[PDB]
């Protein structure tokens, strides 16, 4: 045993699993707005000898020795992070160690707040993220809601937009120490200027959690939360198209100085994390360098055009869009006027190799079965899909919905619907036909990564 | 742009750096007891398309679709984890999603405790981990100490062992909900029978954080925490030799009326603390867990014990004192005070000759700010096919470092003077540059797990 044997030789059962997942990705139409396809170059860094190095601490300030090279990598990741988002290093710093987006958020909170201090975020069914505080009427769900005290803010159901007026009103009463501007299921641009005014008024830090939109921000195809936020968190996957990891950006220098840097860095290590995942950090550096190029601006422009094209294509075929359209990378479809719901559509589409998400619509409860569907452009755009290809994706979705409708008029409950798609031979064949057409279409497009895994 | 271009072609700057680090790992003697060298097989999984899949939730209970293969990979990683530690599926479960060791511990605490509930763990300078609870006298340091209330137990400073008497006494008073049996710098086996007695009396949960010794426990070359603990956490790197990730094992089924760990532990990992699983890590971990079930790994681990034994016996036989007198595991705690030096000095000398080891605070330390010891580990170099005579020769290289360290301590005043004297003084430079060249030439000749060039 050398530990230099190939995976296919040494673990054939695992190698066969990688190959099946590779085929599924190649043959599927990936419309999950948080999905993307990582470049080979980034994955080569990710599965590298950088996994082997413990480097607790920071560059030039490590616990263990032998970090000369790892220090250069982390420092380079830092520079490319600031360059990607066009940040003056006198005015901004960045921590590149969070293990993911959720740890990046928890580290911001533990850095700046005391246990049980107050946070406000977009409610989860209104399109916010678990890590912005989430508790149900029954219990505390996010650790954000356990260690801190959250109160959500809401959409205006009339417009499908964030109700900035109700946020202002309600923040005056609750008096949060931290307000989070950022979304998981929102088709529009956040009024960061308005968020900032509410924060200034109640003396709260503004956190922009730009995970979903970070690549669009890097490419300068939408306005930057960095103009208004104190702290910006993000994932490095999603629209940035890197390995799974996180980033915390913070202001530094004069506001009387900013005091985020030392607190943020201490919270990440030693308070929360152990050894940095240097292999991830390297992969992120690779993706961040990719994000500074003309190629990536053109990619991000195309993502917007494709989402528009998908939105327009849906409108023409008689669908309703929550907020009436999109200004970003995803669209929110309201299926209730069509007579179907998200849980039904999602399952039908899954069986024809189209992966989308059910999505709560404004006004409905976090209890009633979701009336909507979230569809995203980033992943397929990475496979060189253009506007005509997304029109074709919408054709396939429509057939999916129409099958979904017919199965609904023959079934009672949700579990009836789900096993009827498997058992009933006439509908299972109509799905088999659509699946094969979807996969023929999808397989012809290029796919970032390695060929076979 | 396809995203199928090579790293060497598209990012030459980064590729350079991967090669410099691969070279640094090859030419050095890696004596940090937390380090190891991951298999190519595992790295191939880690740098795969599994990075691309969002699979929040658990196998068969995902929030998004298209997870059929990722479900099987997670389930496989579970079964392989249980098999690696010889656990009955009816009596144990395992969560394979923690992003590292620290997240695995925090998730146990948030799963089983309320905020501000009480925790006890071996004090940090007495050989425990940050994540066991660590405050200084100035401030709270670990998040473990911010969100929960930690009181550290200690070593008996005569024996260098864990004072199981004081711990039983002090735990009757503090009333912890959770006591942690685990170490980062302890050369001996832990009395998990005794830990569980203390936990039974005061009605606390016993957590075994075996990160450091998980390979040794899988190999069955030391006794298992799974006989006495109801919760076990580990890294998947270190002695398991996998990718960076973590595991949480927990008891399940009938207690005496069921155990209720499973549901709380899984909920704490997701949705409470983490987001999307790192499926590429989960797969690499599964590969390494397969490797740990094999006869090859038992021999790897036996050789780890023997190589630490041989490093220990060799150090004793050159007139070095060692904390606790010996080792029953993968490392040796070297008290450098009775040889008239200390950790900070030794570490910086050894580093400049491509030997990487750790500063370590010993019981007999009379200052509290510069430690008087050195942690030296087997697992890494053993993975490179080192045997007892190779470790004797490492010790010989160390002895020359320590002796340059002793010979520079008598010619210097403070610790920052000591550090400059190494780089600045030409006779000490080229005595180090000579010792380095010989260490590198010795280390290079041994094999290295992973890819050849990155
Ligand atoms: N955009 C977006 N929106 C989402 O909602 C979402 C999710 C699911 C989030 C989520 C997870 C658990 C509960 C929860 O309530 N947990 C369980 C309750 C247990 C109990 O009460 O004991 C449950 O799922 O029933 C509620 C919500 C993943 N990715 C997402 N992306
Ligand atoms: C190394 C270690 C950890 C933490 O591992 P990371 O991957 O750095 O978070 C936790 N517990 C023990 C006992 C350890 O040795
Ligand atoms: C995806 C996302 C996260 C969390 O990322 P993970 O890597 O899954 O933890 C946090 N916040 C927002 C707004 C997100 O979209
Ligand atoms: Ca713009």
CSV table of N, CA and C in Angstrom, one decimal, chain A residues 322-449:
chain,number,residue,atom,x,y,z
A,322,UNK,N,-44.1,35.3,-9.7
A,322,UNK,CA,-44.2,36.1,-8.4
A,322,UNK,C,-43.3,37.3,-8.6
A,323,UNK,N,-43.8,38.5,-8.2
A,323,UNK,CA,-43.2,39.8,-8.6
A,323,UNK,C,-43.3,40.2,-10.1
A,324,UNK,N,-44.0,39.4,-10.9
A,324,UNK,CA,-44.2,39.7,-12.3
A,324,UNK,C,-43.0,39.5,-13.3
A,325,UNK,N,-41.9,38.9,-12.8
A,325,UNK,CA,-40.7,38.8,-13.6
A,325,UNK,C,-39.4,38.6,-12.8
A,326,UNK,N,-38.2,39.0,-13.4
A,326,UNK,CA,-37.0,38.8,-12.7
A,326,UNK,C,-36.0,39.9,-13.1
A,327,UNK,N,-35.1,40.3,-12.2
A,327,UNK,CA,-34.0,41.1,-12.4
A,327,UNK,C,-32.7,40.4,-12.2
A,328,UNK,N,-32.7,39.1,-11.9
A,328,UNK,CA,-31.5,38.3,-11.5
A,328,UNK,C,-31.5,37.0,-12.2
A,329,UNK,N,-31.0,36.0,-11.6
A,329,UNK,CA,-30.6,34.7,-12.1
A,329,UNK,C,-31.7,33.7,-12.1
A,330,UNK,N,-32.8,34.0,-11.4
A,330,UNK,CA,-33.9,33.0,-11.2
A,330,UNK,C,-35.2,33.5,-11.4
A,331,UNK,N,-36.2,32.7,-11.7
A,331,UNK,CA,-37.6,33.1,-11.7
A,331,UNK,C,-38.4,32.3,-10.7
A,332,UNK,N,-39.5,32.9,-10.2
A,332,UNK,CA,-40.4,32.3,-9.3
A,332,UNK,C,-41.7,32.1,-10.0
A,333,UNK,N,-42.1,30.9,-10.2
A,333,UNK,CA,-43.4,30.6,-10.9
A,333,UNK,C,-44.4,30.3,-9.8
A,334,UNK,N,-45.6,30.9,-10.0
A,334,UNK,CA,-46.8,30.7,-9.2
A,334,UNK,C,-47.7,29.8,-10.0
A,335,UNK,N,-47.8,28.5,-9.6
A,335,UNK,CA,-48.5,27.5,-10.3
A,335,UNK,C,-50.0,27.4,-9.9
A,336,UNK,N,-50.5,28.1,-8.9
A,336,UNK,CA,-51.8,28.0,-8.4
A,336,UNK,C,-52.9,28.4,-9.5
A,337,UNK,N,-52.7,29.5,-10.2
A,337,UNK,CA,-53.6,29.9,-11.3
A,337,UNK,C,-53.7,28.8,-12.4
A,338,UNK,N,-52.7,28.0,-12.5
A,338,UNK,CA,-52.6,26.9,-13.5
A,338,UNK,C,-53.3,25.6,-13.0
A,339,UNK,N,-53.7,25.6,-11.7
A,339,UNK,CA,-54.4,24.4,-11.1
A,339,UNK,C,-53.5,23.3,-10.6
A,340,UNK,N,-52.1,23.6,-10.6
A,340,UNK,CA,-51.2,22.6,-10.0
A,340,UNK,C,-50.4,23.3,-8.9
A,341,UNK,N,-49.7,22.6,-8.1
A,341,UNK,CA,-48.8,23.1,-7.0
A,341,UNK,C,-47.4,22.7,-7.3
A,342,UNK,N,-46.5,23.3,-6.5
A,342,UNK,CA,-45.1,23.0,-6.6
A,342,UNK,C,-44.6,21.6,-6.2
A,343,UNK,N,-45.3,21.0,-5.3
A,343,UNK,CA,-44.8,19.6,-4.8
A,343,UNK,C,-45.2,18.6,-5.9
A,344,UNK,N,-46.2,18.8,-6.6
A,344,UNK,CA,-46.6,18.0,-7.7
A,344,UNK,C,-45.7,18.2,-8.9
A,345,UNK,N,-45.5,19.4,-9.3
A,345,UNK,CA,-44.7,19.8,-10.5
A,345,UNK,C,-43.3,19.3,-10.3
A,346,UNK,N,-42.7,19.6,-9.1
A,346,UNK,CA,-41.3,19.2,-8.8
A,346,UNK,C,-41.1,17.7,-8.9
A,347,UNK,N,-42.0,16.9,-8.5
A,347,UNK,CA,-41.9,15.5,-8.6
A,347,UNK,C,-42.0,15.0,-10.0
A,348,UNK,N,-42.9,15.5,-10.8
A,348,UNK,CA,-43.0,15.2,-12.2
A,348,UNK,C,-41.8,15.5,-13.0
A,349,UNK,N,-41.3,16.7,-12.8
A,349,UNK,CA,-40.1,17.2,-13.5
A,349,UNK,C,-38.9,16.4,-13.1
A,350,UNK,N,-38.7,16.0,-11.8
A,350,UNK,CA,-37.7,15.1,-11.3
A,350,UNK,C,-37.6,13.8,-12.1
A,351,UNK,N,-38.8,13.2,-12.3
A,351,UNK,CA,-38.9,11.9,-13.1
A,351,UNK,C,-38.5,12.1,-14.5
A,352,UNK,N,-38.6,13.3,-15.1
A,352,UNK,CA,-38.1,13.5,-16.5
A,352,UNK,C,-36.8,14.3,-16.5
A,353,UNK,N,-36.0,14.1,-15.4
A,353,UNK,CA,-34.6,14.6,-15.3
A,353,UNK,C,-34.5,16.2,-15.4
A,354,UNK,N,-35.5,16.9,-14.9
A,354,UNK,CA,-35.5,18.3,-14.7
A,354,UNK,C,-35.5,18.5,-13.2
A,355,UNK,N,-34.5,19.1,-12.6
A,355,UNK,CA,-34.5,19.3,-11.2
A,355,UNK,C,-34.8,20.8,-10.9
A,356,UNK,N,-35.9,21.1,-10.3
A,356,UNK,CA,-36.3,22.4,-9.8
A,356,UNK,C,-36.8,22.2,-8.4
A,357,UNK,N,-37.1,23.4,-7.8
A,357,UNK,CA,-37.6,23.4,-6.3
A,357,UNK,C,-39.0,23.9,-6.2
A,358,UNK,N,-39.8,23.2,-5.4
A,358,UNK,CA,-41.0,23.8,-4.9
A,358,UNK,C,-40.7,25.0,-4.1
A,359,UNK,N,-41.6,26.0,-4.0
A,359,UNK,CA,-41.4,27.3,-3.5
A,359,UNK,C,-42.7,27.9,-3.0
A,360,UNK,N,-42.8,28.3,-1.7
A,360,UNK,CA,-44.0,28.9,-1.1
A,360,UNK,C,-44.2,30.2,-1.9
A,361,UNK,N,-45.5,30.5,-2.1
A,361,UNK,CA,-45.9,31.8,-2.7
A,361,UNK,C,-46.4,32.7,-1.7
A,362,UNK,N,-46.3,34.0,-1.9
A,362,UNK,CA,-46.7,35.0,-0.9
A,362,UNK,C,-48.2,34.9,-0.5
A,363,UNK,N,-48.4,35.0,0.8
A,363,UNK,CA,-49.8,34.8,1.3
A,363,UNK,C,-50.1,33.5,1.8
A,364,UNK,N,-49.6,32.4,1.2
A,364,UNK,CA,-49.8,31.0,1.7
A,364,UNK,C,-49.0,30.8,3.0
A,365,UNK,N,-49.3,29.7,3.7
A,365,UNK,CA,-48.6,29.4,5.0
A,365,UNK,C,-47.4,28.5,4.8
A,366,UNK,N,-46.6,28.5,5.9
A,366,UNK,CA,-45.5,27.5,6.0
A,366,UNK,C,-46.2,26.3,6.7
A,367,UNK,N,-47.0,25.5,5.9
A,367,UNK,CA,-47.9,24.5,6.3
A,367,UNK,C,-48.7,23.9,5.1
A,368,UNK,N,-49.3,24.8,4.4
A,368,UNK,CA,-50.1,24.5,3.2
A,368,UNK,C,-49.0,24.2,2.1
A,369,UNK,N,-49.4,23.2,1.2
A,369,UNK,CA,-48.4,22.6,0.3
A,369,UNK,C,-48.1,23.6,-0.9
A,370,UNK,N,-46.7,23.9,-1.1
A,370,UNK,CA,-46.3,25.1,-1.8
A,370,UNK,C,-46.9,25.3,-3.2
A,371,UNK,N,-47.3,26.5,-3.5
A,371,UNK,CA,-48.0,26.7,-4.8
A,371,UNK,C,-47.1,27.2,-5.9
A,372,UNK,N,-45.8,27.1,-5.7
A,372,UNK,CA,-44.8,27.7,-6.6
A,372,UNK,C,-43.7,26.9,-7.0
A,373,UNK,N,-42.8,27.4,-7.9
A,373,UNK,CA,-41.7,26.7,-8.4
A,373,UNK,C,-40.6,27.7,-8.6
A,374,UNK,N,-39.4,27.3,-8.1
A,374,UNK,CA,-38.2,28.2,-8.3
A,374,UNK,C,-37.3,27.6,-9.5
A,375,UNK,N,-37.0,28.4,-10.4
A,375,UNK,CA,-36.2,27.9,-11.6
A,375,UNK,C,-35.0,28.9,-11.8
A,376,UNK,N,-33.8,28.3,-12.0
A,376,UNK,CA,-32.5,29.1,-12.0
A,376,UNK,C,-31.8,28.9,-13.3
A,377,UNK,N,-31.2,29.9,-13.8
A,377,UNK,CA,-30.3,29.9,-15.0
A,377,UNK,C,-28.8,29.6,-14.9
A,378,UNK,N,-28.2,29.7,-13.7
A,378,UNK,CA,-26.7,29.6,-13.6
A,378,UNK,C,-26.0,28.3,-14.1
A,379,UNK,N,-26.6,27.2,-13.7
A,379,UNK,CA,-26.0,25.9,-14.0
A,379,UNK,C,-26.0,25.6,-15.5
A,380,UNK,N,-27.2,25.8,-16.1
A,380,UNK,CA,-27.3,25.5,-17.6
A,380,UNK,C,-26.5,26.5,-18.4
A,381,UNK,N,-26.5,27.7,-18.0
A,381,UNK,CA,-25.7,28.7,-18.6
A,381,UNK,C,-24.2,28.4,-18.6
A,382,UNK,N,-23.7,27.7,-17.5
A,382,UNK,CA,-22.3,27.2,-17.5
A,382,UNK,C,-22.1,26.1,-18.5
A,383,UNK,N,-23.1,25.4,-18.9
A,383,UNK,CA,-23.1,24.4,-20.0
A,383,UNK,C,-23.4,25.1,-21.4
A,384,UNK,N,-23.1,26.4,-21.5
A,384,UNK,CA,-23.3,27.1,-22.8
A,384,UNK,C,-24.7,27.2,-23.3
A,385,UNK,N,-25.7,27.0,-22.5
A,385,UNK,CA,-27.1,27.3,-22.9
A,385,UNK,C,-27.3,28.8,-23.2
A,386,UNK,N,-28.0,29.1,-24.2
A,386,UNK,CA,-28.4,30.4,-24.6
A,386,UNK,C,-29.9,30.6,-24.5
A,387,UNK,N,-30.4,31.8,-24.9
A,387,UNK,CA,-31.9,32.1,-24.8
A,387,UNK,C,-32.8,31.0,-25.5
A,388,UNK,N,-32.4,30.6,-26.7
A,388,UNK,CA,-33.3,29.6,-27.4
A,388,UNK,C,-33.3,28.2,-26.7
A,389,UNK,N,-32.2,27.9,-26.1
A,389,UNK,CA,-32.1,26.7,-25.3
A,389,UNK,C,-33.0,26.7,-24.0
A,390,UNK,N,-33.1,27.9,-23.4
A,390,UNK,CA,-34.0,28.1,-22.3
A,390,UNK,C,-35.4,28.1,-22.7
A,391,UNK,N,-35.7,28.7,-23.8
A,391,UNK,CA,-37.1,28.5,-24.4
A,391,UNK,C,-37.5,27.0,-24.6
A,392,UNK,N,-36.5,26.2,-25.0
A,392,UNK,CA,-36.7,24.8,-25.1
A,392,UNK,C,-36.9,24.1,-23.7
A,393,UNK,N,-36.1,24.5,-22.7
A,393,UNK,CA,-36.3,24.0,-21.4
A,393,UNK,C,-37.8,24.3,-20.9
A,394,UNK,N,-38.3,25.5,-21.2
A,394,UNK,CA,-39.6,25.9,-20.8
A,394,UNK,C,-40.7,25.0,-21.6
A,395,UNK,N,-40.4,24.6,-22.8
A,395,UNK,CA,-41.3,23.6,-23.6
A,395,UNK,C,-41.4,22.4,-22.8
A,396,UNK,N,-40.3,21.8,-22.4
A,396,UNK,CA,-40.2,20.6,-21.6
A,396,UNK,C,-40.9,20.7,-20.2
A,397,UNK,N,-40.7,21.9,-19.5
A,397,UNK,CA,-41.4,22.1,-18.3
A,397,UNK,C,-42.9,22.1,-18.4
A,398,UNK,N,-43.4,22.8,-19.5
A,398,UNK,CA,-44.8,22.8,-19.8
A,398,UNK,C,-45.4,21.5,-20.0
A,399,UNK,N,-44.8,20.6,-20.7
A,399,UNK,CA,-45.2,19.2,-20.9
A,399,UNK,C,-45.3,18.5,-19.5
A,400,UNK,N,-44.3,18.8,-18.7
A,400,UNK,CA,-44.2,18.3,-17.3
A,400,UNK,C,-45.5,18.7,-16.5
A,401,UNK,N,-45.7,20.0,-16.6
A,401,UNK,CA,-46.9,20.6,-15.9
A,401,UNK,C,-48.2,19.9,-16.4
A,402,UNK,N,-48.4,19.9,-17.7
A,402,UNK,CA,-49.5,19.2,-18.3
A,402,UNK,C,-49.8,17.8,-17.9
A,403,UNK,N,-48.7,17.0,-17.9
A,403,UNK,CA,-48.8,15.6,-17.3
A,403,UNK,C,-49.2,15.7,-15.9
A,404,UNK,N,-48.6,16.6,-15.1
A,404,UNK,CA,-48.9,16.8,-13.7
A,404,UNK,C,-50.4,17.1,-13.5
A,405,UNK,N,-50.9,18.0,-14.4
A,405,UNK,CA,-52.4,18.3,-14.3
A,405,UNK,C,-53.3,17.1,-14.5
A,406,UNK,N,-53.0,16.3,-15.5
A,406,UNK,CA,-53.7,15.1,-15.8
A,406,UNK,C,-53.7,14.1,-14.7
A,407,UNK,N,-52.5,13.9,-14.1
A,407,UNK,CA,-52.4,13.0,-12.9
A,407,UNK,C,-53.2,13.5,-11.7
A,408,UNK,N,-53.3,14.8,-11.6
A,408,UNK,CA,-54.0,15.5,-10.5
A,408,UNK,C,-55.6,15.2,-10.6
A,409,UNK,N,-56.1,15.3,-11.8
A,409,UNK,CA,-57.5,15.0,-12.0
A,409,UNK,C,-57.9,13.5,-11.9
A,410,UNK,N,-56.9,12.6,-11.8
A,410,UNK,CA,-57.2,11.2,-11.6
A,410,UNK,C,-56.8,10.7,-10.2
A,411,UNK,N,-56.2,11.6,-9.3
A,411,UNK,CA,-55.8,11.2,-8.0
A,411,UNK,C,-56.3,12.2,-6.9
A,412,UNK,N,-56.3,11.7,-5.7
A,412,UNK,CA,-56.8,12.4,-4.5
A,412,UNK,C,-55.7,13.2,-3.7
A,413,UNK,N,-54.9,12.4,-3.0
A,413,UNK,CA,-53.9,13.0,-2.1
A,413,UNK,C,-52.6,13.2,-2.8
A,414,UNK,N,-51.6,13.7,-2.1
A,414,UNK,CA,-50.3,13.9,-2.6
A,414,UNK,C,-49.6,12.5,-2.8
A,415,UNK,N,-49.7,11.6,-1.8
A,415,UNK,CA,-49.1,10.3,-1.9
A,415,UNK,C,-49.7,9.4,-3.0
A,416,UNK,N,-51.0,9.7,-3.3
A,416,UNK,CA,-51.6,9.0,-4.5
A,416,UNK,C,-50.9,9.4,-5.8
A,417,UNK,N,-50.8,10.7,-6.0
A,417,UNK,CA,-50.1,11.4,-7.1
A,417,UNK,C,-48.7,10.8,-7.3
A,418,UNK,N,-47.9,10.6,-6.2
A,418,UNK,CA,-46.5,10.2,-6.3
A,418,UNK,C,-46.3,8.8,-6.7
A,419,UNK,N,-47.1,7.8,-6.2
A,419,UNK,CA,-47.1,6.4,-6.6
A,419,UNK,C,-47.9,6.1,-7.9
A,420,UNK,N,-48.8,7.0,-8.2
A,420,UNK,CA,-49.5,6.9,-9.6
A,420,UNK,C,-48.5,7.1,-10.7
A,421,UNK,N,-47.6,8.1,-10.6
A,421,UNK,CA,-46.5,8.3,-11.6
A,421,UNK,C,-45.6,7.1,-11.8
A,422,UNK,N,-45.4,6.3,-10.7
A,422,UNK,CA,-44.6,5.1,-10.8
A,422,UNK,C,-45.4,3.9,-11.3
A,423,UNK,N,-46.6,3.6,-10.7
A,423,UNK,CA,-47.4,2.4,-11.1
A,423,UNK,C,-48.1,2.5,-12.4
A,424,UNK,N,-49.1,3.5,-12.6
A,424,UNK,CA,-49.9,3.6,-13.8
A,424,UNK,C,-49.1,3.6,-15.1
A,425,UNK,N,-49.1,2.5,-15.9
A,425,UNK,CA,-48.3,2.4,-17.0
A,425,UNK,C,-48.4,3.5,-18.1
A,426,UNK,N,-49.6,4.0,-18.3
A,426,UNK,CA,-49.9,5.0,-19.3
A,426,UNK,C,-49.1,6.3,-19.0
A,427,UNK,N,-49.2,6.8,-17.8
A,427,UNK,CA,-48.4,8.0,-17.4
A,427,UNK,C,-46.9,7.7,-17.2
A,428,UNK,N,-46.5,6.6,-16.7
A,428,UNK,CA,-45.1,6.2,-16.6
A,428,UNK,C,-44.4,6.1,-18.0
A,429,UNK,N,-45.1,5.8,-19.0
A,429,UNK,CA,-44.6,5.8,-20.4
A,429,UNK,C,-44.5,7.2,-20.9
A,430,UNK,N,-45.6,8.0,-20.7
A,430,UNK,CA,-45.5,9.4,-21.2
A,430,UNK,C,-44.3,10.2,-20.5
A,431,UNK,N,-44.0,9.8,-19.3
A,431,UNK,CA,-42.8,10.4,-18.6
A,431,UNK,C,-41.5,9.8,-19.1
A,432,UNK,N,-41.5,8.5,-19.4
A,432,UNK,CA,-40.3,7.8,-20.1
A,432,UNK,C,-40.0,8.5,-21.4
A,433,UNK,N,-41.0,8.8,-22.2
A,433,UNK,CA,-40.8,9.5,-23.4
A,433,UNK,C,-40.2,10.9,-23.3
A,434,UNK,N,-40.7,11.6,-22.3
A,434,UNK,CA,-40.2,13.0,-22.0
A,434,UNK,C,-38.8,13.0,-21.4
A,435,UNK,N,-38.6,12.1,-20.5
A,435,UNK,CA,-37.2,11.9,-19.9
A,435,UNK,C,-36.2,11.6,-21.0
A,436,UNK,N,-36.4,10.7,-21.9
A,436,UNK,CA,-35.5,10.4,-23.0
A,436,UNK,C,-35.2,11.6,-23.9
A,437,UNK,N,-36.3,12.4,-24.2
A,437,UNK,CA,-36.1,13.6,-25.0
A,437,UNK,C,-35.3,14.7,-24.2
A,438,UNK,N,-35.6,14.8,-22.9
A,438,UNK,CA,-34.8,15.8,-22.1
A,438,UNK,C,-33.3,15.4,-22.1
A,439,UNK,N,-33.0,14.1,-21.8
A,439,UNK,CA,-31.7,13.7,-21.7
A,439,UNK,C,-30.9,13.7,-23.0
A,440,UNK,N,-31.5,13.4,-24.1
A,440,UNK,CA,-31.0,13.6,-25.5
A,440,UNK,C,-30.5,15.1,-25.7
A,441,UNK,N,-31.4,16.0,-25.3
A,441,UNK,CA,-31.2,17.4,-25.4
A,441,UNK,C,-30.0,17.8,-24.5
A,442,UNK,N,-30.1,17.4,-23.2
A,442,UNK,CA,-29.1,17.9,-22.2
A,442,UNK,C,-27.7,17.3,-22.5
A,443,UNK,N,-27.6,16.0,-22.9
A,443,UNK,CA,-26.3,15.4,-23.1
A,443,UNK,C,-25.4,16.0,-24.1
A,444,UNK,N,-26.0,16.7,-25.1
A,444,UNK,CA,-25.3,17.3,-26.2
A,444,UNK,C,-24.5,18.6,-25.7
A,445,UNK,N,-24.8,19.1,-24.6
A,445,UNK,CA,-24.2,20.3,-24.1
A,445,UNK,C,-22.9,20.0,-23.4
A,446,UNK,N,-21.9,20.9,-23.5
A,446,UNK,CA,-20.7,20.7,-22.7
A,446,UNK,C,-20.9,20.8,-21.2
A,447,UNK,N,-20.0,20.2,-20.4
A,447,UNK,CA,-20.1,20.1,-18.9
A,447,UNK,C,-18.8,20.4,-18.4
A,448,UNK,N,-18.7,21.5,-17.5
A,448,UNK,CA,-17.4,21.7,-16.7
A,448,UNK,C,-17.0,20.5,-15.9
A,449,UNK,N,-15.7,20.4,-15.6
A,449,UNK,CA,-15.2,19.3,-14.8
A,449,UNK,C,-14.3,18.3,-15.5
